[PDB]
UniProtKB/Swiss-Prot annotation:
Effect of residue 71 to A: In sporadic cancers; somatic mutation
Originating species: Homo sapiens
Mutagenesis / variant outcome for changing residue 162 to Q: In LFS; germline mutation and in sporadic cancers; somatic mutation
Effect caused by changing residue 141 to H: In sporadic cancers; somatic mutation
Annotated effect of mutating residue 64 to P: In sporadic cancers; somatic mutation
Effect of residue 140 to S: In LFS; germline mutation and in sporadic cancers; somatic mutation
Outcome, altering residue 175 to I: In sporadic cancers; somatic mutation
Phenotype when changing residue 151 to R: In sporadic cancers; somatic mutation
Protein known as: Cellular tumor antigen p53
Covered range of the whole protein: 96 to 292 of 393
Protein backbone atom coordinates (compact mmCIF):
# COMPACT_ATOMS: atom_id res chain seq x y z
CA UNK A 1 0.00 0.00 0.00
CA UNK A 2 1.43 3.36 -1.11
CA UNK A 3 -0.23 6.55 0.22
CA UNK A 4 -1.23 9.01 -2.52
CA UNK A 5 1.10 11.93 -3.26
CA UNK A 6 -1.27 13.76 -5.59
CA UNK A 7 -1.30 17.51 -4.97
CA UNK A 8 -4.83 18.49 -3.95
CA UNK A 9 -5.78 21.96 -2.73
CA UNK A 10 -9.32 20.94 -1.87
CA UNK A 11 -12.12 23.20 -0.70
CA UNK A 12 -9.89 25.30 1.53
CA UNK A 13 -7.18 26.00 -1.04
CA UNK A 14 -4.52 24.21 1.03
CA UNK A 15 -0.84 24.39 0.06
CA UNK A 16 2.60 24.57 1.66
CA UNK A 17 5.12 27.40 1.70
CA UNK A 18 8.83 27.55 2.42
CA UNK A 19 11.22 30.27 3.54
CA UNK A 20 14.02 31.55 1.33
CA UNK A 21 17.03 30.50 3.36
CA UNK A 22 19.71 30.57 0.68
CA UNK A 23 22.59 28.18 0.08
CA UNK A 24 25.44 29.38 2.31
CA UNK A 25 27.66 26.58 3.60
CA UNK A 26 26.39 27.34 7.11
CA UNK A 27 22.66 27.02 6.31
CA UNK A 28 20.86 24.23 8.24
CA UNK A 29 17.62 23.98 6.25
CA UNK A 30 16.92 25.23 2.74
CA UNK A 31 14.21 24.60 0.17
CA UNK A 32 14.63 24.30 -3.60
CA UNK A 33 11.52 25.34 -5.57
CA UNK A 34 13.09 24.10 -8.80
CA UNK A 35 13.52 20.61 -7.35
CA UNK A 36 10.56 20.75 -4.94
CA UNK A 37 13.07 19.49 -2.42
CA UNK A 38 13.99 20.40 1.16
CA UNK A 39 17.61 19.90 2.26
CA UNK A 40 18.27 19.84 6.01
CA UNK A 41 20.75 18.81 8.67
CA UNK A 42 20.01 15.99 11.07
CA UNK A 43 17.44 16.87 13.76
CA UNK A 44 17.49 20.59 12.93
CA UNK A 45 14.39 22.81 12.77
CA UNK A 46 12.60 22.77 9.40
CA UNK A 47 9.95 25.49 9.11
CA UNK A 48 7.09 24.52 6.86
CA UNK A 49 4.26 27.00 6.19
CA UNK A 50 0.59 26.11 5.82
CA UNK A 51 -1.49 28.37 3.54
CA UNK A 52 -5.22 28.34 2.92
CA UNK A 53 -7.75 30.44 1.02
CA UNK A 54 -10.44 29.87 3.65
CA UNK A 55 -10.61 28.74 7.28
CA UNK A 56 -11.00 24.97 7.74
CA UNK A 57 -13.37 23.73 10.46
CA UNK A 58 -12.29 23.44 14.09
CA UNK A 59 -10.85 19.95 14.54
CA UNK A 60 -9.04 19.94 11.20
CA UNK A 61 -5.57 18.38 11.54
CA UNK A 62 -2.29 18.33 9.63
CA UNK A 63 -0.43 15.04 9.18
CA UNK A 64 3.10 14.39 7.89
CA UNK A 65 4.32 11.03 6.58
CA UNK A 66 7.45 9.96 4.70
CA UNK A 67 7.55 7.55 1.75
CA UNK A 68 10.33 6.41 -0.56
CA UNK A 69 10.31 8.31 -3.84
CA UNK A 70 11.59 5.58 -6.17
CA UNK A 71 9.03 3.11 -7.52
CA UNK A 72 10.91 0.00 -6.42
CA UNK A 73 11.08 1.21 -2.81
CA UNK A 74 7.85 3.16 -2.29
CA UNK A 75 6.30 0.04 -0.75
CA UNK A 76 8.83 -0.08 2.09
CA UNK A 77 8.06 1.72 5.38
CA UNK A 78 10.34 4.71 6.05
CA UNK A 79 11.84 4.43 9.53
CA UNK A 80 14.90 5.38 11.54
CA UNK A 81 17.98 3.20 11.14
CA UNK A 82 19.08 0.61 13.69
CA UNK A 83 21.50 3.07 15.26
CA UNK A 84 19.27 6.13 15.54
CA UNK A 85 16.23 4.24 16.79
CA UNK A 86 18.37 3.29 19.83
CA UNK A 87 20.16 6.54 20.64
CA UNK A 88 17.73 7.67 23.36
CA UNK A 89 17.21 11.12 21.87
CA UNK A 90 13.52 10.98 22.70
CA UNK A 91 11.62 14.22 23.27
CA UNK A 92 9.17 12.38 25.51
CA UNK A 93 6.46 12.19 22.84
CA UNK A 94 7.85 10.83 19.56
CA UNK A 95 8.49 7.08 19.37
CA UNK A 96 12.24 6.50 18.82
CA UNK A 97 11.50 4.74 15.49
CA UNK A 98 9.84 7.74 13.82
CA UNK A 99 11.79 9.70 11.23
CA UNK A 100 9.58 12.80 11.37
CA UNK A 101 8.92 14.76 14.54
CA UNK A 102 7.04 17.95 15.19
CA UNK A 103 9.07 20.26 17.35
CA UNK A 104 7.55 22.26 20.21
CA UNK A 105 3.89 21.28 19.94
CA UNK A 106 2.43 19.52 22.96
CA UNK A 107 -0.62 18.43 20.96
CA UNK A 108 1.46 16.45 18.45
CA UNK A 109 0.30 12.86 18.11
CA UNK A 110 2.34 10.00 16.67
CA UNK A 111 0.69 7.17 14.79
CA UNK A 112 1.84 3.66 14.01
CA UNK A 113 -0.71 2.53 11.41
CA UNK A 114 -2.19 -0.81 12.46
CA UNK A 115 -2.51 -1.95 8.83
CA UNK A 116 0.27 -0.34 6.79
CA UNK A 117 2.66 -0.04 9.74
CA UNK A 118 3.63 3.40 8.43
CA UNK A 119 4.52 6.19 10.86
CA UNK A 120 3.05 9.69 10.87
CA UNK A 121 2.85 12.72 13.14
CA UNK A 122 -0.30 14.85 13.27
CA UNK A 123 -1.16 18.19 14.89
CA UNK A 124 -4.25 20.38 15.11
CA UNK A 125 -4.61 22.93 12.33
CA UNK A 126 -4.50 26.36 13.97
CA UNK A 127 -4.91 29.91 12.64
CA UNK A 128 -1.84 32.12 12.22
CA UNK A 129 -0.47 34.16 15.09
CA UNK A 130 -1.88 37.67 15.20
CA UNK A 131 -0.18 39.67 12.48
CA UNK A 132 0.78 36.67 10.34
CA UNK A 133 -0.77 35.32 7.13
CA UNK A 134 0.11 31.62 7.46
CA UNK A 135 0.81 29.03 10.12
CA UNK A 136 4.22 27.45 10.54
CA UNK A 137 4.93 23.92 11.73
CA UNK A 138 8.47 23.03 12.76
CA UNK A 139 9.57 19.54 11.67
CA UNK A 140 12.69 17.53 12.51
CA UNK A 141 14.14 14.67 10.44
CA UNK A 142 15.87 12.25 12.72
CA UNK A 143 18.10 10.24 10.34
CA UNK A 144 20.44 11.13 7.48
CA UNK A 145 19.36 10.08 3.98
CA UNK A 146 22.58 8.05 4.00
CA UNK A 147 21.89 6.06 7.20
CA UNK A 148 22.80 2.41 6.72
CA UNK A 149 19.94 0.01 7.45
CA UNK A 150 17.60 2.98 7.24
CA UNK A 151 17.00 5.24 4.25
CA UNK A 152 20.37 4.03 2.91
CA UNK A 153 20.78 6.80 0.31
CA UNK A 154 17.23 6.37 -0.99
CA UNK A 155 15.36 9.65 -1.59
CA UNK A 156 12.13 10.21 0.34
CA UNK A 157 9.10 12.42 0.00
CA UNK A 158 7.20 14.01 2.85
CA UNK A 159 3.45 14.04 2.26
CA UNK A 160 1.49 16.62 4.23
CA UNK A 161 -2.24 16.05 4.44
CA UNK A 162 -4.98 18.29 5.72
CA UNK A 163 -7.58 16.03 7.39
CA UNK A 164 -10.93 16.45 9.05
CA UNK A 165 -11.50 15.25 12.61
CA UNK A 166 -12.25 11.72 11.28
CA UNK A 167 -9.06 11.57 9.24
CA UNK A 168 -10.78 12.11 5.89
CA UNK A 169 -8.80 13.92 3.19
CA UNK A 170 -9.26 17.69 2.81
CA UNK A 171 -6.01 18.63 1.10
CA UNK A 172 -2.58 17.28 0.19
CA UNK A 173 0.87 18.59 -0.73
CA UNK A 174 4.35 17.03 -0.78
CA UNK A 175 8.08 17.66 -1.18
CA UNK A 176 11.24 15.60 -1.52
CA UNK A 177 13.67 15.65 1.42
CA UNK A 178 17.41 15.11 1.71
CA UNK A 179 18.82 15.02 5.23
CA UNK A 180 22.52 15.72 4.87
CA UNK A 181 25.53 17.39 6.46
CA UNK A 182 25.72 20.36 4.06
CA UNK A 183 22.26 21.34 2.73
CA UNK A 184 23.53 24.53 1.08
CA UNK A 185 26.18 22.76 -0.96
CA UNK A 186 23.91 19.86 -1.83
CA UNK A 187 21.08 22.16 -2.97
CA UNK A 188 23.52 24.15 -5.11
CA UNK A 189 24.84 20.93 -6.66
CA UNK A 190 21.47 19.36 -7.42
CA UNK A 191 20.14 22.61 -8.88
CA UNK A 192 23.20 22.77 -11.15
CA UNK A 193 22.72 19.16 -12.23
CA UNK A 194 19.08 19.92 -13.10
CA UNK A 195 20.02 23.00 -15.13
CA UNK A 196 22.47 20.88 -17.15
CA UNK A 197 19.98 18.02 -17.57
C1 LIG B 1 -6.00 36.50 3.52
C2 LIG B 1 -7.34 36.27 4.20
N1 LIG B 1 -7.79 34.81 4.02
C3 LIG B 1 -7.07 34.15 2.85
C4 LIG B 1 -7.73 34.46 1.52
C5 LIG B 1 -7.75 34.06 5.38
C6 LIG B 1 -6.63 34.53 6.30
C7 LIG B 1 -6.96 33.92 7.65
N2 LIG B 1 -6.93 32.42 7.56
C8 LIG B 1 -7.25 31.82 8.87
C9 LIG B 1 -6.65 30.44 9.01
C10 LIG B 1 -7.30 29.51 9.81
C11 LIG B 1 -6.74 28.22 9.98
C12 LIG B 1 -7.46 27.29 10.80
C13 LIG B 1 -8.06 26.51 11.48
C14 LIG B 1 -8.79 25.55 12.31
O1 LIG B 1 -10.16 25.92 12.39
C15 LIG B 1 -5.54 27.89 9.34
C16 LIG B 1 -4.91 28.86 8.54
I1 LIG B 1 -3.06 28.38 7.60
C17 LIG B 1 -5.43 30.14 8.35
O2 LIG B 1 -4.83 31.08 7.56
C18 LIG B 1 -7.87 31.88 6.52
C19 LIG B 1 -7.64 32.54 5.16
ZN1 LIG C 1 20.01 6.99 11.22
Amino acid sequence: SVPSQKTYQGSYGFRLGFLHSGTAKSVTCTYSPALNKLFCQLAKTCPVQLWVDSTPPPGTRVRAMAIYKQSQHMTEVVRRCPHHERCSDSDGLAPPQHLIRVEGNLRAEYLDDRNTFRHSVVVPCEPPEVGSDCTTIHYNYMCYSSCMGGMNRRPILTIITLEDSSGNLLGRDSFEVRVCACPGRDRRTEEENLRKK
